Amino acid sequence: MSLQLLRNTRIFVSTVKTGHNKTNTQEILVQDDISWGQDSNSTDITVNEAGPRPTRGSKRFNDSLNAAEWSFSTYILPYKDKNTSKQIVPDYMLWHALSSGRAINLEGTTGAHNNATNFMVNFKDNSYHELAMLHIYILTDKTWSYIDSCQINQAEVNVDIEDIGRVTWSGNGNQLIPLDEQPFDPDQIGIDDETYMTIQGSYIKNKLTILKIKDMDTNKSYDIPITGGTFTINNNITYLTPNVMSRVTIPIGSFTGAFELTGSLTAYLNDKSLGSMELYKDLIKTLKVVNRFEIALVLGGEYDDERPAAILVAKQAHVNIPTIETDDVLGTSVEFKAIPSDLDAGDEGYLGFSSKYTRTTINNLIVNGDGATDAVTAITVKSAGNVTTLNRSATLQMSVEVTPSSARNKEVTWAITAGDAATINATGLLRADASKTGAVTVEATAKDGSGVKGTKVITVTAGG
Template sequence: MAEFLHFSRDTKMYLVKDNRAWTIPVLDGFSFSQATNASEITLNEMEDASGRSRRGRKMFTDSLSAAEWSFSTYTRPFRAAGGTTYSADKGGRAGSAANASHAVEEALWVCMGSKNVYNSTSYAWNHGATGGAITSIATTSGGTDAGRSAGTYTIAVPGTNVTIASNGSNVAASAVISVVVNGSGVATSTITDRGIGFNTGSTLTIAPAAIGGGSANLVLTVTSESFSSDSTDLDINFFDSNRSSLSTFDLYFVLSDKSAGRLVYKLANAVVNEAAVDFDIDGIATINWSGFAGQITDFTASVTAQASPPTASAAGEIWIDTDDSDSFFVSEGTGTSNWVHTIDEGTASTTNFIRNRLTQLSLAPDATFKANNSAVTYETSYQVAITAGNITISNNISYLTPEELGRVNQPIEHVTGTRTVTGSFTCYLGSSDAATNKSKNLFEDLVQDTETVINEFELKFDVGGTASTPRLEFQIDRCHLEIPSHSIDDVISLETNFHGLGSSIGEADEITLKYVGS
């Protein structure tokens, strides 16, 4: 009987959700584990008449902790070839639209910031049955009505004077729209509260009585999406992450890939807790992912590994094609013809890695904050060339586990905590006799501003540069900066911590991401 050893360098990882699989190459150092919670009972008594004192103890396994996992991936944007072929040519396409920007790791971002489901018909991510938050609104009709009175009007959705149409089976809740009408009766609409329960294509018809009279209804069309890919870029937001739980998925780690002794571990009901990006000046742009799962199981016996398609008895089964370099398939139905190849486009490319050295930082005070600040005259922008930096996005997730006696309790569900966007950047202490927007000036302005308890800066990391491809942009529109700290080395530097904030304490628009493929 053969005995096998398993090596981390022979490992492949797959993310499976909604009967689709994504190949996500991971770096050395990945881990997954699950601990137990135990109780100890001890005896501690004085001697009896015979001089005997019992000092024993007993252990009880109370519950399994939530499984914990972590791994790192490179940031790898690319442009899709297009088409919908998944199994015929044994190549998993990222999307049906040719030349659209995608990323190898995009599924992790979508699951981290929403409850999206994957639509196998449109080959795209969509909101589930509960709908999503409003991403943007556009005026469809009624933008101008000379009979309107000028003013600013706050519109609650749903409301007495608002009709929601084309919203599927969802029920929109708690959105707020601000409509500004100028002296010519032109209405300009902005989102105050993105709400939840909307679909792309939903329409909001606002009656004249709610916006200063006149005769024309104002009709707004809603876009609601956490993931948008086109020929320009791939946009990812967290607008729909104001939920008590987020998207779950299964992770499969195939150990000893392409070997008869392979092991397959399944991490069921996994969820992304944190994504951290470090800008190492001499490295390749990398994301460090970590999260939880309900349970780790040895799934080897449940995986079919053979050269021809097996007969699937249900959707969601796994087949490893041993005749095609252990290609990974998921069934979307029964029989032998419903196997779908893992989505692996971009994983074999050598041109979609990003060099950190090309990263640029844009830093400017928010225009309104700058105009209203009387304590310090902030510069329009600051010229800061960074030497290092990092961003961490965290869902601060915890797991609910029952505490029934007489059994080993299992984790049942995750619960989101406070969403945080934090980070820091390091730069040399620079000054100039010809400019007043260097790092020295940033330090001075922040120190001197003793009247502002929350400052607001617009911060953007262009990982890979501002114009070259591939690249990844992190945009934080409202960023609170801490006072920089000095580091006294051969070249004196400043380290500045920052905190991404929403447009209000209830909004989830602290950060947006933009991938541009090459």
């Protein structure tokens, strides 16, 4: 009688089947592209004979149930909750399931976990045969229905100008189940209007898209205006089902396959220095089997005032040779896929979601890994007593200052590049001797990899 409507359907994500509370269930900001359903495998039996009387017969049997299909898209709207005062995306257990299979723990360091500054999602503890287990609850009008033991297969992140920032989720469940009784009241679990205002206070617009590309073999950072992009995280999950003739069967667990983090970035060709054309010609010139690039795509842009933004940080990526795409105005496409340091070392990449980004915050998130931990920005090597020169056979212990003063890693290395008339140790004691009449330089770079440069030309003379 009463017809169920699509627009009135609300989704609930849970980690447990009983005792649903605010810490285990949430209302998901799903769009109007929802779709789900479970199909089955069937077998037909035909008979082929040669007698005078052919047997035109066909007998059908049900054999098994395929995986339940579910897919929906949500808005990327990071925010801070009033309870914890820490930036968390509304759909945080989805990112936890995509990241690692451990118990949900925002106070840890692996998987989806927040902080006072930003919400960061790493895949360092992803090396599992089975990720975190969810339960997609589908409340269409009044009738209940949920999908048993869902697991996130992939997360489709679309980054295109003229398009608002969104993410599309698609996964599979063991068995979709319809329910008659309410598992839990949706009103108090569902987000109230105040946190809806708090969430809508932060929107991410993909029109402001700035890319950080830097090769680790040459450190040639480029300036590329983005036309449109897309990067996805794939788990390659396959459900395993038994094969029994007598009765039908349902899937039993799964085994996550190979982790894939691929992305496609479209951008216009530029003749300007460090532009798209220079990147393309450098890549098509140095044809190398292996690539090692710093790619840091920043959705929503960067600003001095706190602004909502989404960040991808791929430390050691693999850039496929670009193919310049012909159109009205030449716009090329670059394909990348983040490879790890070691196949089982994790650290494929990590993401940043928060409404409160300053350029320094995103910078230290990119270089150090967290939006809260500070990193060095500039370095000037300091002589032991404002000294400008050195004579032959004289010791000089180099000192150094770093900025900001709140940097977590402040120690720097000591090296000599230009000139051969002195030496430096781990502590910085520069030493000279006889037959040292040439000008020499001294270098200093911190171990956090900010790209900081500490330089000073000391005029080492022959002495008195």
